[PDB]
């Protein structure tokens, strides 16, 4: 009997920017 | 009987500016 | 009975900038 | 102004700003997994 | 101002800029996880 | 019966700037 | 002006700005994780 | 100014600035990670 528990849990109260460019090319 | 039990929780209460540049030209 | 319990907990109450470059040109 | 019995205020900014004055020739190539034969 | 009983106030500021002023040439490639054969 | 606990926290209350530069020009 | 029988006043700012003023030119290249036979 | 009895006040900046001027000629090439062959 094999248990598995996972959580993940994000809570954001606030700003968050996030910005991610692969190859890009930003002016 | 295996159990595993995993919590990831990310909290934010405040501004988080991430910037991922891969392979990218910013001007 | 192997139980394995992994925590990982990030509160942030502030200002986090994270910028990751990574082969990129940024002017 | 704040003159109350008590008064929380938070002012988060995130600015991020990517600007180019440009006066001439700019280049840009990007290759990113890129597999040329 | 603040006379408050009391009062509590945070500013949290990221300010991430890039800013270019070319007056020339700038030739920019880049190359990432690329395999030339 | 083997038990292993692993917990890691990160509270932040204040400005972190990280930045990690891999193989790329900043001007 | 705090004249509080309390105050708490946090500023917290991370500031990057990247600036380049460029009269002339500027080559770059990046390799990254790039074989090339 | 502060007239209250408490009042806390932390001020905390991290300034990360990259200025470049350049009037001539600047190359720039990264190779990380990179096997040639």
Same mark, same amino acid.
């Given at each position: 009997?094999?248990?598995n528990?996972?959580?993940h849990s994000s809570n954001n109260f606030?700003?968050?920017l *996030? *910005?991610?460019n692969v190859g *890009?090319?930003?002016y």
């Open positions: 009997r094999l248990a528990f996972l959580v606030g700003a968050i *996030s *910005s991610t *890009s090319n930003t």
